[PDB]
């Protein structure tokens, strides 16, 4: 029953011609609900979840103004960082930003985040106390000194503990049928001979939400990691996720092996056996 709101910004310079490509996306937990793309036709923040579509014109106007401002900020900062790193005007570079808030089952602030990257590596991040910054190198240290003198952390903190939490609460209510639902995994096992003497058992988890899940194999009641393989959790494309875990076993010994499934949607972990 804990929840999160996160926004993700990616700005990529294109020296061959025009402004950076800027893409912003917003999430509640594992559900995307808004987007902005500088190259799309609307030039508006756009809905990507049915439950946000009820917000009024005033909402979209405010979100569009703020996200367009952020794209210009990123444009400027791409030029500044190119200079800090003594880079040429000729190449493409990337700024990424993530921020947002976590709340407990009670709806109250738990944690806030704000962190920034340059060309895929840490640049500057707000620490968990929301009062201090971690700068990865001497370029980011410049930013850190400027942001401390400007008291940026105070303003970030006020948003993360304030409006971030308040709007996450509103969205959880307006979208509750989906956002406050847990969908436990639909599970089954398959069996695939490799030879006359060995077979693959594959434990499947489908249709679950949220994405966090754990699949574990045991043999005769004890965890087994040897001879196992698993795929990374992956989106089905319909708002649910999928995962599998497999183990190779001596043919005939299948009944010694159990797959154990943990998910927030399951009040007790599930156990499957061939």
């Amino acid at each position: 029953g804990s929840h999160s709101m996160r926004y993700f910004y990616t700005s990529v310079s294109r020296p061959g011609r025009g402004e950076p490509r800027f893409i912003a996306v917003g999430y509640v937990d594992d559900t995307q609900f808004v987007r902005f793309d500088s190259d799309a036709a609307s030039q508006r923040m756009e809905p990507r979840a049915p439950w946000i579509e009820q917000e009024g014109p005033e909402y979209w106007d405010q979100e569009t103004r703020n996200v367009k401002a952020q794209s210009q900020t990123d444009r400027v900062d791409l030029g500044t960082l190119r200079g800090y790193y003594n880079q040429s005007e000729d190449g493409s570079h990337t700024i990424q930003i993530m921020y947002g808030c976590d709340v407990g089952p009670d709806g109250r602030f738990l944690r806030g985040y704000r962190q920034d990257a340059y060309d895929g590596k840490d640049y500057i991040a707000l620490n968990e106390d929301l009062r201090s910054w971690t700068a990865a190198d001497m370029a980011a240290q410049i930013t850190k000194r400027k942001w401390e003198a400007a008291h940026a952390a105070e303003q970030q903190r006020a948003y993360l503990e304030g409006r971030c939490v308040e709007w996450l609460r509103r969205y959880l209510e307006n979208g509750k049928e989906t956002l406050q639902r847990t969908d436990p995994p639909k599970t089954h096992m398959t069996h695939h001979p490799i030879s006359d003497h060995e077979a693959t058992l594959r434990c499947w988890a489908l249709g679950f939400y949220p994405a966090e899940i754990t699949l574990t194999w045991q043999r005769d009641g004890e965890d087994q990691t040897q001879d196992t393989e698993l795929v990374e959790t992956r989106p089905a494309g319909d708002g649910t996720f999928q995962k599998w875990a497999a183990v190779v076993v001596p043919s005939g010994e299948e009944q010694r092996y159990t797959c154990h499934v943990q998910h927030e949607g399951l009040p007790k972990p599930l156990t499957l056996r061939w």
């Binding site: 703020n66 400027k146 400007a150």
Partner: peptide
């Protein structure tokens, strides 16, 4: 809703 528009240059 996103953070307020307030420019803190890097």
């Amino acid at each position: 809703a996103i953070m307020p528009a307030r420019f803190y240059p890097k």
